[PDB]
Amino acid sequence: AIDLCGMSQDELNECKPAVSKENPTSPSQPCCTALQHADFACLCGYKNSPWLGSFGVDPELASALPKQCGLANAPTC
Template identity: 55%
Template sequence: MAAGKFVVLMVMVLLMVEGSRAMTLCGMNDQGLEACKPSVTQPNPVDPSPECCKALKGADLTCLCSYKNSVWLGSLGIDPKLALDLPPKCKLQMPSFQKSMKLLSHVDVKMFANLVSVLC
């Protein structure tokens, strides 16, 4: 009986630790997404900060481009055109057109929930 309680306690601790870790979106963590938010939202977008460019440099740009036509961007206040303008402003090579036009077949619910909590 005591061993069963210990296992349940350990599982709960592991779930809490895993749940507290920051999620990433295409290689960008919460801080990177937050750093880029002022550059991708209207009405007065600003040039990307060094922190934003650093986050983009480590991100999977092809993955980020796959969100270009996502209905979720508008609901988060993100202007897709402004988002596509970020890599050149950070002097980063844009992924090929064909790769960036891939559409996602699904959206990871946890990732979307985390993105909403960071950007909203």
């Protein structure tokens, strides 16, 4: 079990389909709720991580997810 920028592995997996390059889907409730305790500036630090490629994450969709979730703050990356 890990904490990456406020999100557990379970929560990152919950959000994964809403940031996938291929066939993304609308964010789930559990994803949006978890993002309410995530550290966006911390998450932005992963913008160039090889992990985005490995997990098929789209950095643009990832950037867009807080707004999709109706959060008031949004990731400066």
